[PDB]
Amino acid sequence: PDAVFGDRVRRFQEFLDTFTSYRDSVRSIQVYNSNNAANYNILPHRIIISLDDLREFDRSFWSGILVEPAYFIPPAEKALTDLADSMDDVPHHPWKLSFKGSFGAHALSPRTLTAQHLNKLVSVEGIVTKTSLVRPKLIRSVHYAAKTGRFHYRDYTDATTTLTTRIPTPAIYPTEDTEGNKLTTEYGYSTFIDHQRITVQEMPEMAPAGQLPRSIDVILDDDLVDKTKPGDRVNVVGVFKSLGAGGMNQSNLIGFKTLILGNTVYPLHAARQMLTDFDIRNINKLSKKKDIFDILSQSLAPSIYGHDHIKKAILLMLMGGVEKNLENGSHLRGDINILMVGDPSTAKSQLLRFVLNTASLAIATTGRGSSGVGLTAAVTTDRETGERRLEAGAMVLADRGVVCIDEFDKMTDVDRVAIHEVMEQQTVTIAKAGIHTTLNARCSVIAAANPVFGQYDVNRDPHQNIALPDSLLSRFDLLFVVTDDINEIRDRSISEHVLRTHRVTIPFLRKYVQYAKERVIPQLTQEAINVIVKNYTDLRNDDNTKKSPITARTLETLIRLATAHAKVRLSKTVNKVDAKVAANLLRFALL
Amino acid sequence: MSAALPSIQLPVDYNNLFNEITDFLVTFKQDKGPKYMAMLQKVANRELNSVIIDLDDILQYQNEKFLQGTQADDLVSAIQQNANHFTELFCRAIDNNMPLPTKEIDYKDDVLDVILNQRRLRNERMLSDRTTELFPPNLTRRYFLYFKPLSQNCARRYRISSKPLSVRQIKGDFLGQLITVRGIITRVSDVKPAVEVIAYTCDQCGYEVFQEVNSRTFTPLSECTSEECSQNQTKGQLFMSTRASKFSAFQECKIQELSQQVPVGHIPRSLNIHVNGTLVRSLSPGDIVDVTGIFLPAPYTGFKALKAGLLTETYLEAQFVRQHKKLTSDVEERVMELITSGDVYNRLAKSIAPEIYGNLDVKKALLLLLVGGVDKRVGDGMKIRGDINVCLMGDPGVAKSQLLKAICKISPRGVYTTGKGSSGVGLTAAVMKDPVTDEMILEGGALVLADNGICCIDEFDKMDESDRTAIHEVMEQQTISISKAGINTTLNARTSILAAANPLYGRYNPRLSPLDNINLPAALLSRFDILFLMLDIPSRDDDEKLAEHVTYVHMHNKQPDLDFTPVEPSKMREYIAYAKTKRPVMSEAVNDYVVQAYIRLRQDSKREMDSKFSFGQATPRTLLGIIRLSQALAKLRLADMVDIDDVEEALRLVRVSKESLYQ
DNA sequence: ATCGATCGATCGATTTTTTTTTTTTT
DNA sequence: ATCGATCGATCGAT
């Protein structure tokens, strides 16, 4: 090997010796690796490094890694593993480096790429799609020669091997190694890596005016594998690999399939998240107030007048409603689903955009829709190596998240029947060709629909006004009709805010709620029951002479509603005080 | 050669461990002599083939090679890493330590072992006048060997290989590893015997040829390799002798994830596994099991230069299986807790669906179809049901779908279904291409699957026509008719039938007359013996008390009280067929009386005449069933005496099925 | 010694493939 | 990757 390789390794001594912060971090890995060794008789070898130090270290070695990482990297690979030996050599292996950056040039999105940006480690970000599923891949092989014994040994290198190009050496597989003895395949002594490959589309948000997005591939190996689900927003960083022939490989047009390899691919929220102390204390401070919730309500409609009762239901839906599953019996549905309805220009779909942002999971829907929505729709045939692979639709892809529906009334009933399976059953069922499974979709959901006919959504009865009979009505825990009714007293209020439109903090909310989600579930208290039992019964005792439908499922929501406010209060226990809130919005549900 | 394919040292060595293997093989203490002695003769006794091994006992003898020295390197830590070297080399010592006779082979017994001695009869006589090839140790085995790993109380000894895992929990480093994962079975394509070594025969020069074959394929030898035909101008002809060559039974299955292990996103992972030996036929599709086995890749064929890199893609092999949820003698007494309790017709009636409140009278009739009977044989012959078809009419849902959830669960041949849901093609044998193994094999279900058992049904109005006609014929019962394709068959459906269906939109209107509210065809309702109208009017007293039960849970997991003790299904079910063996014979006393109330019902139902409450006409089919009802009701009394109250008891349920339309 | 046929080393060619958006009929 | 045919030479026959 050239000293150019040995010197670069030698050039990496003082670094990361300075900054030495990674030195013990790997040792922090060493210990935890040793830690698990203590209990059983898990951490990946690869380590994070801020590239920045090269700017205080070698600017030539700096940009070179940005230039020819293929060269500078491999020596940096050794010293890490090399020092890793020296770090702990006592007890008796890629050890990769990520580099958050410290960017960039080399900062580009996938839509705009190369030819110059090729063969260079670069940050690229976007949707994870469609994310080819993982398969296992060997490198090293080993054997036993009987009856003479000993042990055989074999190594492998593919096209995607390491970083740089190397001579291709498909070996078939080692057998009958001289002397000519039978060689039985040996495993677990031999080396393996599960392989993964995924493309990534550039963001439609950052997408240009009139053109379609182009998703580009990246390999996923070892820990890099399965770090993320498909459809995620994430920034990949690594060298761009051009490997493969231009049709010249066989003497006889388009050419050179290409993708980026490694490295970090930091998940990006645009969840996660850091909390700390100062921040959560605001939660801890704000939690004391019972006056906070309306503030929680008012923050929801920066551009929106009122409908705060409609708003209150939204956050209560953010809570999740405290899923409680029967022991060796079926769970009752935990989460709440609603549909906005009313005369045109309601800004109901507008509201979904608000539901669309801080929500963080998940995908919305406008009318049609399908085939299948969250259905995999049987991704087929094969793809790949003859292997049938289903790819979950949005409804599945949205699991443990929000579902917004625009033009829900216009949607085909074909998949509506599935939405019964989607909502009441709250799980996915699949038989097509095919794979046979029932997979959980517990996703929280909401929809929106116009009046069946015209502006008469007021005058005409709400039944026949549903536009989507029947059990569809039973499904949704709340249906709010939006009257387009106008008032000069109203319009006067309507103007200036619409006027101020053209010319308590929101982000703090989702952090307040997200932590409010895992901590802490209020469970149940009979005291809330005591009033509500007389409530819902009385609701069937009166409302049936007023409106409908009225079902115990609506009562089941009461537990959901109060369950949410108990979260809104951050109460460790349910209170009957919350019911008055739920019942009232339920009062508003009727009126 | 040196360099390429370098010989590489490892601290692990089995050279003396193989001796340490035979130290453990045979000789043993904890379980007169060691368990491995007469048990290995037990295989030499040929009453057993499968050899079962566990990691549990290895630890104690490893403790026996430990404490209790002299000290020796651990086998078990070299096992889970490879262990395939242990499926042979540890096992290859068995010919050294196995007893010779060990008893008489007789005749049959079986073939093979009479031939295999003849193969060795021909093999030894080859060298008898010859004065030196011999049948390899792998060539003659006749016994399978299995491993069952330790979880376990040994792991807390303290002592890993047994920790249950998801497919998602499956690392690439676990290749070669004997491992254990919990998962749902899938596929389970049929098992077939697979040969390890072909037996060719030279004819002319004779002898025997054995060529190893691995994985999915092999390259068959030709000509003659026999040395008698070697160097002689004439090479003998040869082709595989199937009687001679050894076979191995090969099954396989996909294993789905439990779905609780799954991430909130992504997808359930099916896992290909291949069943072999005595371990075959140990599983069915969709069963949940903690699977324990070694995991090895099986490349390639190809392709080849396609893959590259190789990217093994591997698979799992099944070492061992642990399944989840695996007279009229002395079980009559298990019937006798409620036998001494009496109230068989009620307490059990109250025993039905303790989870849902009230409507015990509805549950009261539920007990009948859960039993039914008993049919008839006219000798004409035309057999008559024999079976109860019940419908449930009311909306909104009322949680009516839940009644079917309890009923089918308890019921043998329990099948839950819904309008869409299973089609009429789902209730018939329907041709479909079978993935992997081919081809176009028919798979029936539903009605065909639910025959000789209850079928619960929902969305019964949305089953449309294609289903209606089938079940229309399923009311003709005891048949499923397909004239489709080249298939002319009509197959017996003994299915018990119950479907609850929703009234015309939005909900039922009391002003609406009967049969105008119903979405089902009249001829479809006429062959129905019973329908329970589920119309729900709010009752503040009842609303509270039910809400109270809706308060009582979620409050606790245990609902029933103040007071009752619902029978568990297993002990409850045992009385079902036990009662179904009865076949009560009708007393003529109640016999003519049922006729009397019939012409009364043939009178009063017709005197209702036009529209309104209805339904007429009180056809004999209902009386034909109502007679069967007391015949089904008598079964709970057993005794086959058919009491008149037993008869009239059904007549009480007849009017009750209706007349609630006044409410 | 001319001719041959014979075997072998030479040469080079062949290895996957059907499902989700449709559309004229009452 | 293996199988397939071309084609080259060589050792026997006449």
Ligand SMILES: Nc1ncnc2c1ncn2[C@@H]1O[C@H](COP(=O)(O)OP(=O)(O)OP(=O)(O)O)[C@@H](O)[C@H]1O
């Ligand atoms: N509460 C409100 N606050 C501010 N603007 C509102 C409100 N309600 C309605 N609007 C106005 O009405 C219009 C609604 O248009 P938008 O496309 O959002 O309707 P939508 O939600 O799709 O309703 P639909 O589904 O009936 O079309 C917007 O221009 C919006 O400014």
